[PDB]
Subunit: 463 residues, 4 copies
Amino acid sequence: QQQQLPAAMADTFLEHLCLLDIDSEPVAARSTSIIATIGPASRSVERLKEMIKAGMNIARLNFSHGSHEYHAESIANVREAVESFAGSPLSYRPVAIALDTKGPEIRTGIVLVTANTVDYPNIVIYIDDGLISLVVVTVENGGVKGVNLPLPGLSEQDVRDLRFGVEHGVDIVFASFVRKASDVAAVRAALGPEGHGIKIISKIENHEGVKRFDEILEVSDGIMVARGDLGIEIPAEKVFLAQKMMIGRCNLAGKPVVCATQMLESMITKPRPTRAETSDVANAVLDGADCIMLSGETAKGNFPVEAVKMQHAIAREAEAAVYHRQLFEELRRAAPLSRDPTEVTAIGAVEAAFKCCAAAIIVLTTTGRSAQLLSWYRPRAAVIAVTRSAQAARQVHLCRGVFPLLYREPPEAIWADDVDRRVQFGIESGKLRGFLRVGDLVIVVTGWRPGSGYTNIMRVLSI
Amino acid sequence: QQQQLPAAMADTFLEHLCLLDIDSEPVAARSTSIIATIGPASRSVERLKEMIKAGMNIARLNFSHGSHEYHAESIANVREAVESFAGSPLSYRPVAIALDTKGPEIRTGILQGGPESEVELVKGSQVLVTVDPAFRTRGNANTVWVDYPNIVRVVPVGGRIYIDDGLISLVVQKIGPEGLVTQVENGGVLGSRKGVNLPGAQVDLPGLSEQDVRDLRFGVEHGVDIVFASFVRKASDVAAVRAALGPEGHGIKIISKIENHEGVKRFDEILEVSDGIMVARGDLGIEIPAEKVFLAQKMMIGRCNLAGKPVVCATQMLESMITKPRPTRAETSDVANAVLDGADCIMLSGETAKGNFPVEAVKMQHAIAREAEAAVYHRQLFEELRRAAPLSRDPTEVTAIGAVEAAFKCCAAAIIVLTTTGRSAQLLSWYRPRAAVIAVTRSAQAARQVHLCRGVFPLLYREPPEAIWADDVDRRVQFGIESGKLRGFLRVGDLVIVVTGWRPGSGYTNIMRVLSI
Amino acid sequence: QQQQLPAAMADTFLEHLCLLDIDSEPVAARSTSIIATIGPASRSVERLKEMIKAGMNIARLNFSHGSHEYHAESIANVREAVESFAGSPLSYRPVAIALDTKGPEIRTGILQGGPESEVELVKGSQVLVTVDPAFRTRGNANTVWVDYPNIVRVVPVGGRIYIDDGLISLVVQKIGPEGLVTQVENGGVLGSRKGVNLPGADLPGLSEQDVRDLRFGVEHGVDIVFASFVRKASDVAAVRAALGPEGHGIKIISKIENHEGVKRFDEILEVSDGIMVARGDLGIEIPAEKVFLAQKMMIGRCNLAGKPVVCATQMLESMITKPRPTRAETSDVANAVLDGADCIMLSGETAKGNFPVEAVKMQHAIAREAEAAVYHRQLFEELRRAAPLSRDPTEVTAIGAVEAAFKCCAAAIIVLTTTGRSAQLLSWYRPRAAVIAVTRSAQAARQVHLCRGVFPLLYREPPEAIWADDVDRRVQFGIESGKLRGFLRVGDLVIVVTGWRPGSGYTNIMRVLSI
Amino acid sequence: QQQQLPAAMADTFLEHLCLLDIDSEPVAARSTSIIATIGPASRSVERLKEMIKAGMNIARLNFSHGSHEYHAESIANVREAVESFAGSPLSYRPVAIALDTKGPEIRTGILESEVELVKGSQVLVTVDPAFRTRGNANTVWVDYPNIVRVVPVGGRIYIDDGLISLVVQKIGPEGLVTQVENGGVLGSRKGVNLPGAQVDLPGLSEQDVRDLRFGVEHGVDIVFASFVRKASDVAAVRAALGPEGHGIKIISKIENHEGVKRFDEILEVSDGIMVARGDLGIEIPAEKVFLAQKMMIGRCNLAGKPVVCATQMLESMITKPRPTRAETSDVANAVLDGADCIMLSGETAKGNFPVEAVKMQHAIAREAEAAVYHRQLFEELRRAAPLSRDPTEVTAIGAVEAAFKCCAAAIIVLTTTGRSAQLLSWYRPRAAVIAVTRSAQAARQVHLCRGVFPLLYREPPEAIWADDVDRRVQFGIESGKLRGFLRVGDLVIVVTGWRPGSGYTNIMRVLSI
Ligand SMILES: O=P(O)(O)OC[C@H]1O[C@](O)(COP(=O)(O)O)[C@@H](O)[C@@H]1O
Ligand SMILES: O=P(O)(O)OC[C@H]1O[C@](O)(COP(=O)(O)O)[C@@H](O)[C@@H]1O
């Protein structure tokens, strides 16, 4: 069998692992999203072209580096690479643009903290990547940038940066050093009226944030486990607890979670990843992460495309080995009851999908909310979302296993007939890229009248 | 809270019990069906009228007694009692009519000048069983006759021979030239024509006698809805019934009676060809040790649950009520477990055919079953299905499971299903929602056969079809809603699930929608 | 396979059922205890002898009837029938003797020259209920006499009055300065000295008599007190008070017979030794549709707390008159057992019916099967989970002994016990292997019948010089006994639980032996 | 609370995660074992001393390199560092010695220079005696003659950690004309993999035989066998191992498809299994290892045999004083997966941070283990485990259950071979399993099992077996106190037998301290 089905039917977790099969080829669209950071190594349009084709979904601007002019070009490039496949509505792959806020970093001069002597005033102690170590009139590690010490979250610059972001129609803000819920209100304030549209993904990068995680989760659209700083700010042995914990809470709350930093580092320099790294990816996926990310790997290294091609392979397998069985069960039980017709339909659509090994669930969505309520349960069938809002169609990448499709055609006269052309559009698209073959069954989720908020029907159709 | 919700939310089975509340008033239509047997105590229309109001759902004809003329009258009466409430399509309660085949019985002679007379059998007494046309009548206390000749060549020295209801007991302590000479291991008053069983003995009687055939033919002729088949012992036996039923009655459901070892042994082949099963505790508790029935019942109700087919739990659930206006603790308790075991319906015999308290008997089944059902631990139960249930590719199954799950999510009050044959209602109850499954159908027959299914509530839709299929479907749906409101399954504000199809005709259900009332 | 093993391995409850086998002969001591009430039908010694051999474990004195002198004789007869098998220490089956407190009953009078003669109460007719002692002996179709004086300043007009097992029925329409004037709502054939129930309508739990009765109990060495109409934990403190210093030994089994009791059931569980679900009065005091929930609930909480629970009244009624039980009745037993019941009981069936021995032989059969169909799997699991942690070497061993038993399909767990405590902590988990308890205290060896699947063996031999060697003769004694009565055959494994030094409270060792 | 207890009591896996606490200090012996490979970076006695103190448990000789004389010295050093703490029988930490068989490698020739191979550029692969050292940017020589007859036209050929890639483009008379599909700096005598070729090279060469003979002669405790591909292969090793060493545990390395394919037959005949991510990760797609790992650890768990997770768990430390996030997290999952021990290679043999590499595997494993969800876990075994009639199985399960009931601090077992200790850890108590034995060897082999802490008992036997058994028990408790596994008031479980000798465990007792 394929997609680890035998292992998907085991009665306990153990037997399940006992049943994983290295010759059980996956056969599914990979559903974890890929965020690639744009940098010299990947700024050109041609390179972008390739990285999409490889599976990129979200491009990341790192405002820790580079002028505004510099990033203006980056967006401009992404967008161009992207529209180069406007070629064929059935294959067009939207790409998000996320701006990674620079935040209150602490760099150093171009041992007495002030080779022997070293821009955060009230400092009055680790330099670079945490390889260098000094202790308070102080040096405990050696070595030939960041400065982390186990400031305002929103500087004048940060503000300036978000304004830029709004002005340029970025889709997502990854917010650096969120340490308390007031901090995301800040971002959202700076973002201004013109941009309630933009998802806020709070970065967790230190103890306090870890500590106040719950308040933070409640006000954000999602979370980023920033193992980079976090893994210096706290003992390096503990991160795996913060990640696992955070992915889990996030999973419960129905919000997209991102696992970050050093998942494929060696590739910065080399054409294959270590065994550690490969295995780092599978587990982030198995853990529950919504999307997994690349930095050095894509921004400066000799193998940007290859980096992306891997996350894509690893994630495919990983996702074929998820123990939905225990997993879906666990949710229903944990999920509180609900009276909102959309929740209700989605849980239905999902149960339905399991009963028949549905190939996909197809949902007309305006904002994507309903797409999202389908993946809260983590179907295994693909969630194909047909929408006209190129933006929703993009933001929908923050959600496991939802595959946006942007629908261009001008509305029919008759609502009924339009809905149907949008559905069938999904199916067509579906066939074309190979999510469904004739004979398959498919679930289709829709509404009883035009506009967001009214999803409430589920239907079973054979292809 | 009501309907045992807090016990419905317990993390384990044990906690769940620990949480049952005797001041947690149920609040749901009872969903185990009640079969009442019609007899003198309940053959009048007025009485019939009462017993429906009390919750009867299926009337049972016991072709082990009485002429065809006699049973004609019974149908004729049910039907009349039943249309006495045609008075409001929203309250009209269809009722099944089930013919309980008489099968290969072994009753005894009519006593000495006594169709009323009772001899009295004494412990430690020689008794002659005979097969002589002579003693056909000539019953005494030292002699009995049996309508099953071959019994001499089939009971060996030492074997036990049971008379009337297992209550009277005898052991063959001498085979020879005419009688079998037995010692009365069991005492008590014997009648005319009572029942005989010979455990550990292999009975050879055809499942389907000429009569049995005759009876089915009558049944088809009069439009009964269900055949309960006595003594089914192997799947060829139901092919028999269905054969005799003839072309004019593929419509009729066949409910194989399990009444002995062999049948229990070949239970699987049996289950596969029938529409359901009846656990016939009566004979089955004489045919095997009486300590072992409870296993046959619990096993059979389980397998049946799995297969998706309606199962019935039978005989002596309320016996003391044949004589008495209240049940023993045993009896009350016996019902709750039938329902907690999984039983699709639970039945009444003496209790409704003979006894001084027919209506009351039915009122009780109804109360008991309400509580038992409120006390069902769906939680573990639904789970266990999904898991046991194999995968399926049939759009209907798929919808039903969906509808169901959807109903849990919102505490849906009802699932409304348009159905032509009932199939689709059935697939909804296979999972045992807890919301009521209201089935709107134009086939008065299906609408009746649907009573064999836990928590389905037929509504017969009369109106002639609209021009536009769409509009028709919608008047049928709303019909259900109206009905629903009227009898109190749903109040404004409630949510409801509606299950329908994409084109006219059976076999195409495939849509599920959520509507507020 | 036997003992429903294939159904014992099923992955869910459902498949478990799906796999019960009527041709899967049990092969296990039955572990639910049988309580038989003693009465004329079962008072003789020879009958007694028979009923033991059939499986009786506990004889029940019903102090609702019969003088002290009468019950004295009964005990004296049990004990004799019992010691008639002292003849082989390896077979001897101890029997308990339990006294069933009469409590705050309400019964009618004897009939107008009618100790076994009946009036016939007719539906819709006037019945004069009376409190006048002059009429005590004057029962007719128009007058029932009741031994509860206050019934007149307690039962309101409109009120209902059930008579004889809730079968007769009477509605109070006028309070009189000398009695009640009711219209018969339900009629039937009314006899003498019959139980009266005034539901929804000051009788002390412990009357002077009750006290008198316990004193008798203690005086004669009864083992258990089944306490009628316990409605609140202060009621058992009362019984225990009356039982007095000479009897802390005696187990107290609080009887649940009404709403309040059901309502306060927790406080009552906590102070008693066990509980009896008295379906009789319970089934009249509350709606009859609800008992099955007070039974299921009570059995469960009891199961959780580690306390024996008893399932009572009308399990085999038709046998009072008939040589076979109804299909209801049979299936009532199996569920009591499948529910969790520690012991299941007979009353009419054994005290006044024509089939006492048979009654007992059925409860025995039914319960053997029923115990072969318990779903331990989910069961043992649920316990460990529910059970709190514990730091008491005995719990800790027992849980161990038990898990160990499961691993190997142990045939039995053999336990040395002085008081039986340790036997009990083995059965809290409901092993499936039999818990054989070797003890020198004929009393513990008896009280240990309150516990599911513990089979006492009374060890007579005078102690060896060497503790070690004594322990070992007591173990091996168990094994011998076990072989003899068929709990274990060569090749079986066995678990053996014991202590590191003499006296109660020190169990702490578990060992695996092959036979 | 500590040791992730609140997360320990969650009703489902998810809640369990939701409940992990980064301020919930662990408080338990780490129970995953640490194998560290001895190399220049860690061959001195002083360094060895340090590495033990940091947690090392098993030392690995890699017979892929270095003469016998060379490994003789390594043993001779381990042993010395080790007995440097014979100084207090309560602290002494035994250390295994494991011989990592070299096996059927294909390695290249000699040029510290590195000819650089370039993408596109044609490479000639040879087996020609004469070009043994002539090899160049355009010529690589391999020590496996047959490479030419067995790599079909268009088969791939990797060189060095799969970093160089070559597709056979033609096969002329004197060898493989490939095309450098992946380029790189190439070194000397470097490892070469031919996936989807059917290599005919014998598991057990003459050398391999020679090597085990050395192993036996010198008393190594464990053989990690390279490139086990079928059960007949371990019989070989066991044969070579010879009569004088039935003692030695054989741990079959899994390093390729076939092995992964026959994994069952292989599991049944070995003492354990090594998931060799190195070769395995080049022999199959690299995206698939995590399923070989997860699968093999799980089956292994079921079977009751110790499993090792191998290769590149901390790589960057070869060069750096801290691990990458990837690497850290690689360790925790090995542990959460079920791994019996986790291993170090470059990190301990060649790198600039041997002691540190060991310190980290220690810290990560501590937490990983505190965060184990026994709850679901123990359950899952009992259910999976088939029934058993062996009194030792039965006691262990029992001792274990017992340990959960009272938050036993430790399970103390007298063991002769260690088997019974092993059956205690099959269930993964959470109390430590302290094993008192007189066989310094078992006491070392025992480190292949999660959470078993050998204690070597020296004293000569009492007259009275009873009394002996008791001094051995109490010995544990003493030790136990001394190193802090147990404090007064603690409860403890003790497992023993009814008579002297292996095979007869059968008693379980509860004692308060
Ligand atoms: O943005 P959401 O919340 O997913 O809403 C999905 C909406 O899409 C629809 O299916 C179609 O809406 P439009 O016709 O406005 O495009 C609605 O029925 C439903 O309300
Ligand atoms: O009898 P079944 O198999 O339940 O089929 C139910 C049928 O009822 C419908 O909802 C309506 O059918 P009709 O219009 O023929 O009455 C169909 O869509 C569906 O096929």
